A paper describes a structure:
The hyperthermophilic endocellulase, EGPh (glycosyl hydrolase family 5) from Pyrococcus horikoshii possesses 4 cysteine residues forming 2 disulfide bonds, as identified by structural analysis. The crystal structure of hyperthermophilic beta-1,4 endocellulases (EGPh, glycosyl hydrolase family 5, T opt = 100 °C) from the archaeon Pyrococcus horikoshii, that was isolated from an oceanic hydrothermal volcanic vent, has been determined. The disulfide bonding of C106 and C159 forms at the end of the loop associated with the substrate-binding active site cleft.
To investigate a role of the disulfide bond in the activity and stability of the enzyme, we prepared 3 mutants of EGPh; P74C, C106S, and P74C/C106S, in which we removed the disulfide bond or changed the disulfide-bonding pattern. The structural data demonstrated that the substituted C74 residue formed a new disulfide bond (C74–C159). The newly formed disulfide bond (C74–C159) in EGPh was located at the conserved position for the disulfide bond (C34–C120) in EGAc. The neighboring residues around the Cys residues were not affected structurally by the mutation. The structure of P74C with 3 Cys residues near the active site showed the same disulfide-bonding pattern as that of EGAc, suggesting that the conserved C159 prefers a linkage with the substituted C74 rather than with C106, unlike that of the wild type. The wild type enzyme was thermally unfolded at 103.4 °C. The melting temperature of the 3 mutants was approximately 101.5 °C. These results indicate that the alternative new disulfide-bonding pattern involved in the position of P74 did not contribute to its hyperthermostability.
Residue numbers in the entry: 34 to 410
The structure:
């Protein structure tokens, strides 16, 4: 049931790593970071114009992280795709390698450091996050076939825990139109061509056929269906990939022991949500909002919930409420035992969030990290 001898599964709401030969099981927690770049025109994780790739992984490990979420686009996982923006004096062992080979080298090195890797099909093109898992020139079959090829190749790396099926299903128009106009993802609306809960089953099933040992990470949508979204006062103000309110009545039809729900959640640096106003009760109003959008999926329904993205500038060149926001979110995660997450991002070159690293790609933001470090202990 595994090409590596290692099998990942959810027991209760906790992820376990199973050695199938010895029978040994260990619960694991994912203290993760997003290192992005393979999903961009660079076709490689960013920062290698300033840093050595291995030094980066060591620095990540040095801060107590044990997991990396690795966004990719279709092109980066095809042989022959050339990366742009590498300083080869700092990265001599990367000379001659295409994007796929660098991805392999990074995953293998991460594994050597005991770092788990989650593969994230972040973009179909390499420019922006499409609202759906297909485009006019790239069909759902093309999407699934790509995942199959990725699972065949990377399923052989022991430390790859699975597949984040599609980054941030979302809408590009407003409701109630968004539910039916076919431009955006839905959940429980009924049309299997827009319903992410149905698509996730189709894509997930295909992956589990070739990588039965993997977990399937399924993000939220932005809007689900009018009955669900209208059932809660802040039902129309969830993030892309962050609306899991339809899980209760419309659960994804996959084996529970292989499924992880993976919401994204953000603060005032990404969008000035009305509920970030003290006028609306910020920040003491946040736990109930998080609980409704996604928290109940673990606390009430007992599924594995892993926060796939969260982050913000933490008062460095952004909205100073972000400091309060990130502190409250970490407090809530600790209190409710959400111990699995991927911070967005390791990279500093994220326009609305910044990262763990500062713009010099070398020094970390001490305060931002100190808060996060609380989740690690």
């Amino acid at each position: 049931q595994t090409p590596t001898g290692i099998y990942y599964e959810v027991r209760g709401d906790t992820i376990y790593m199973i050695n199938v030969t010895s029978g040994e099981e260990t619960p694991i927690h994912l203290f993760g970071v997003n290192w992005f770049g393979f999903e961009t025109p660079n076709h490689v994780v960013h920062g290698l114009w300033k840093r050595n790739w291995e030094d980066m992984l060591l620095q990540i490990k040095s801060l107590g992280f044990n997991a990396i979420r690795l966004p990719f686009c279709t092109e980066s996982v095809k042989p022959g795709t050339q990366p742009i923006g590498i300083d080869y004096s700092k990265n001599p062992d990367l000379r001659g390698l295409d994007s796929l080979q660098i991805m392999e080298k990074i995953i293998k090195k991460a594994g050597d450091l005991g770092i788990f890797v989650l593969l994230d099909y972040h973009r179909i093109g390499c420019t922006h996050i499409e609202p759906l898992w297909y485009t006019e020139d790239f069909s759902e079959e093309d999407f699934i076939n790509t995942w199959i090829e990725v699972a065949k190749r990377f399923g052989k790396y022991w430390n790859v825990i699975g597949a984040d099926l599609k980054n941030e299903p979302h809408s590009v128009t407003s409701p109630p139109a968004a539910y039916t106009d076919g431009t955006g993802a839905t959940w429980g609306m009924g049309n299997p061509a827009t319903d992410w809960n149905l698509a996730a089953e189709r894509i997930g099933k295909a992956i589990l056929k070739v990588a039965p040992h993997w977990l399937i990470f399924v993000e939220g949508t932005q809007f689900t269906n009018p009955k669900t979204d209208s059932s809660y006062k802040w039902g129309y103000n969830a993030w892309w990939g962050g609306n899991l309110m339809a899980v209760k009545d419309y659960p994804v039809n996959l084996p529970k022991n292989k499924l992880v729900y993976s919401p994204h959640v953000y603060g005032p640096d990404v969008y000035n949500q009305p509920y970030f106003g003290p006028a609306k009760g910020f920040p003491d109003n946040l736990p109930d909002i998080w609980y409704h959008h996604f928290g109940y999926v673990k606390l009430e329904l007992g599924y594995s919930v892993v926060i796939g993205e969260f982050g913000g500038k933490y008062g460095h060149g952004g909205d100073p409420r972000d400091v309060i926001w990130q502190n409250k979110l970490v407090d809530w995660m600790i209190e409710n035992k959400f111990c699995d997450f991927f911070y967005w991002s390791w990279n500093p070159d994220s326009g609305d969030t910044g990262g763990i690293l500062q713009d010099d790609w070398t020094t970390i933001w001490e305060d931002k990290y100190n808060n996060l470090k609380r989740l690690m202990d």
